[PDB]
Amino acid sequence: DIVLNPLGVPSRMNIGQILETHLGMAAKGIGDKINAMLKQQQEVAKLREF
């Protein structure tokens, strides 16, 4: 949904964004792993395990 430029990180030394862009991906990785489990309505025993 956006296409930033990678020639902004070498000069401007903000390596925050390139780390928030990964941890922002692991968090939304759990998002699609629960949204599938909750969509087959597996159980309230499987959710509490994950």
């Binding site: 430029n5 990678p6 020639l7 902004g8 990180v9 070498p10 000069s11 030394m13 390596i15 390139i18 780390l19 990964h22």
Partner: protein, 1343 residues
Amino acid sequence: TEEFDAIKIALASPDMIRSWSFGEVKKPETINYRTFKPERDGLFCARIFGPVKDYECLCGKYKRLKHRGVICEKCGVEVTQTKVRRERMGHIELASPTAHIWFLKSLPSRIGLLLDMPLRDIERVLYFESYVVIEGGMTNLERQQILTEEQYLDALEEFGDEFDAKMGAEAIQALLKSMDLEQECEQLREELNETNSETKRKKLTKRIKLLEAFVQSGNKPEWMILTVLPVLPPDLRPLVPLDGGRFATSDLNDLYRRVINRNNRLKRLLDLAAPDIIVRNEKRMLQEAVDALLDNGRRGRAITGSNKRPLKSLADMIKGKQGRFRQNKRVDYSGRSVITVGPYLRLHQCGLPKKMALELFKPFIYGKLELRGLATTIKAAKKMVEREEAVVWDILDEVIREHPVLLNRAPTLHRLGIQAFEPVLIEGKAIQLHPLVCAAYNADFDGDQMAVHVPLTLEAQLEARALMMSTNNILSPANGEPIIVPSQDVVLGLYYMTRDCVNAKGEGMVLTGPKEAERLYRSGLASLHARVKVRITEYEKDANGELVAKTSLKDTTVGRAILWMIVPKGLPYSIVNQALGKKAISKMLNTCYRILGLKPTVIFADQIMYTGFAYAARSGASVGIDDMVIPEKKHEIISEAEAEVAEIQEQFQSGLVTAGERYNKVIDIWAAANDRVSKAMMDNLQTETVINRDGQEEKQVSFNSIYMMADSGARGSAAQIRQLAGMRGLMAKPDGSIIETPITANFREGLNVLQYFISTHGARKGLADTALKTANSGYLTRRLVDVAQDLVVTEDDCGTHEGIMMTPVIEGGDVKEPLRDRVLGRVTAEDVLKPGTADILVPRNTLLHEQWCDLLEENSVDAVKVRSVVSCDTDFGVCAHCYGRDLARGHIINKGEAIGVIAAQSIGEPGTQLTMAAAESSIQVKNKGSIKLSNVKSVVNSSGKLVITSRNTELKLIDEFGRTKESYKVPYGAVLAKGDGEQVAGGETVANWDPHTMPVITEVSGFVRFTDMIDGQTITRQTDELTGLSSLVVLDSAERTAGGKDLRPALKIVDAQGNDVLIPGTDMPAQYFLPGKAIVQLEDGVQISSGDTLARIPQESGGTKDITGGLPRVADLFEARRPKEPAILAEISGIVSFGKETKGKRRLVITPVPYEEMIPKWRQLNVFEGERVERGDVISDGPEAPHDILRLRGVHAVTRYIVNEVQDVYRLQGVKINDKHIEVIVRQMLRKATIVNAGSSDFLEGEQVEYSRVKIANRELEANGKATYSRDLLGITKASLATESFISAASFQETTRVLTEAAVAGKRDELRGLKENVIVGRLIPAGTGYAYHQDRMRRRAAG
């Protein structure tokens, strides 16, 4: 109004101020408060400043169009336009005189030095505190004695007549009125000759020069005491009614009401006959109100009523707001928006939104809709454009067929900040802009806006297409380097396209041209960078502009072939065969300019941008968190220097080492560990990949996407990669001192709080300078472009045979600039030949373009004599050949071009980014060549060494071709190695000297004579036996104590019989003054040899933080400030000799082969008693100011000093600027000359050099000589004041002092300039307007 010229200014007499005005303003009231019509005889009258409503009287008896000139009888308004209420003037009739606060309180009091009266006494008379006599006659009183209240009253009882004393402003009108400028003029022409005083007969000629102005000008003296103050017109100080009832008055109707009220009362007290304690307090109160009007602030600052800010008088309206009141002009037909990218455009077009272009081009659109008959009348076209009917969107597109617009960004530094463009209508609200040009404006695309203008007339949209178009400016004017280099993203596209892997898809196959190499990669077989063999036909222009094919089998990649299909014909294939970084693209456009001209290079500079952007998108060049590789040995490199420093702090613990050698030893142990991390990191990024062949493994250059952006030069370099992976340096606290512990973690691991608070500082000093370097460099380029304003190429060739010599700069063992890049694009005054005689290769004066340089590159010339613009002989400008070659274009500089202002911007546009192993033991050069030394007088000694004498020993390491390679300097304490013609080994010392000591080596030995170095008088008595050391410091000229000051320290070397042994090659015996800081080991009693070191003079040079420079040096260099410690010079080459001493400071003599000049006592001289000195040679030590250089060595001497320092602040920052630009400011900086002889000028004045050379070329040209001058040198701030005009000075400098001095003399500004010619609003005389000025001076004085 006719073609006027020569605005003329002078004083105004009360019979003239009564002639502008149309009536007397005799009440303080303004309007009526009930019906807001203005009252009669008040400030806002209608009988005085004309009517209010257009074409009708005030009462209401004359409205018809029949009565159009009559003046009404009820209220005498003249029925005319209400515009005439804007250019009439009134006048108040003062009931008593009053001094003009400008001509009374301006620092040289023009009322003062016209009477020879101390200004503190005139002020004691204008307050009615002390009488003053007039016409004393036969009594004990002069004409201007200051009788106090008693002394007059103690004088008045004796005499009643033959005597007149006055007091107050009506007295100075009596002194001036009777004084005669002819009697005391010639009578002072004699008094100046009798007076013998360098101060008296220097100010004496100042007064007599003022009296000589008040006569030929035509101004009487007593016009500087007002008697009718004129009032402004009532529409330049409006009383407009705001919305809601309040009015918004100007701040002058508060000051005029305060004079007309006080003046109106003082009319009454002379009819009611009050005592003289009140009316004498009235005039003192009026005169403070007239002087609060002219220039309020030089008094008690009569702050506004009903508010607490000071009022704003008349002279606070012209006075700088940083610039003029007139034109130094907000503008119609404009706009502004947020720029964006739009990379599909050609080079010569920019987007322009429909919603804007429909609003700037409105009056044009009205033309079509009434021309094509679509609208009947103009009112019916205004309603068709408001509806946005679907027809106007097709008429608006034909109005914008070829109509160039002008984009311009806000802080316009240089001339490339304004460029035209041909618009193309897009939809949106952002002004798109071609990416190549965004580096000229210096525009990032993160919110920067850009105005757009519109050239209206028919000559104004050709000047926006011939001169200003965006495809004409591909060479920046500051230097020939391009300005359309593909900047940031494309340059990484091409670098990725033209590399080579080691084993990719389809390696070793052989292709059949660029067309097969492309489609082979598109289909998917071969990789974009895989080694391959193609066949490519390159062209080559070798005849008179013809091309020839040459087919062969080049060995390349697949990437380079695809890029070969873009390059035009004339270029060779060794231009796209390298790795193609960013330094190689920038030249690949340059060679395409010098060869194929500008038609293909503008269309080749776009095929790069379309190819770079394309193949970077397929690259997928992303950056991650594992791209930045941390080295594995970072721990060991950090722990060793961690422990190794823990064991030096102990050495200070047990008191072994002092702290200063504790601190600097800890700094240099971290710098070892800080540099073993970069060298341990970059060797891990560079050779990252190790890929395999079909057989073994072999390594290459990496493909690390955070290295590729550093090696291409796309963005950032190893000075910043070192902080993402390596260790993050060591920081400085606010003093400027380094902290002991460096921040030891990069930006991939965290920085704990105490490491971040340390780093947080440097981001504050970083921002508090860039916020200031703009405000500071914005004032250095505002002065350069106001001294160099009026300079213009105004002749095709001058004729003068006098130039300068352009020797390449020599930086010890390195060259700062090659000889070629300094002399490219210039004429040649004397045709140099081959070093063999009669080998004239470069002819008489010709342009040194890209070939005649390399022709002189093939040969072995070491210097050329080029024509510089500081020596041209033209009047008012410079010829074409003298200036030279440079332009955005490549031709010679066209006649008429305005080189003045494009030279002051090339020096000011930098600076915004230019804000600001130290051992020195052995003279080790990279070369081996003969040594040719000049300005030396040295002798071999018994030590087997050519003995050193002074610091005139420079070591010119001649190369194999008759040139110079390296320059050095050999001071005392320097033992020499080789001779003359015998070389020196690779990195070997022909001469070694003492770094840590400046010793004196023994020329002649013998016993020692205590010559003014006796114990106690020069240094207290200390005993030291046969070992040969001591603790005795022979102090020097500025390091000597107080007691025995009748001595000059030196130990007289004596011969075998007892005489003072002499210096070989001179007259004086050996009296070798041991310089300061000298712990002299040589005490008498022991015999020494000839060739021993006499005393230590230490010199550490550890740290090297003892240098000036920066941006203030460039401003402090042009202004020519005397640097607090100047170096003396030799006014005449003769014999050295001294005289009477200890007058508080020493003295000296100079005599031809008498000239007497003193010398203070602080400086260790650099001369001997028996010496023949060269004129203007260093007699002492000090950074000599520019004034002394010009007075002695010549005009080319002060030029080559300024041009070499100011070029020494930039080149150490990497800023290219041609030194032609710093010579059209050293020309405009010394155009004032003072006279010596006479015949037409008065022998001590100051006149412009053009004047002295138009008489001397005229008077001496006629049958009688009937002068001699001396060049002067003044800063850019004082040299832009003394111009001939008075508008080019009053515009930018202090204004209160340039109108006062011009009004007294009655100047006549002849409008021959630029900044004096844009004010009046006409064609500036340089550029497209210079042509029509050829016809205006060719019209007057003839038909």
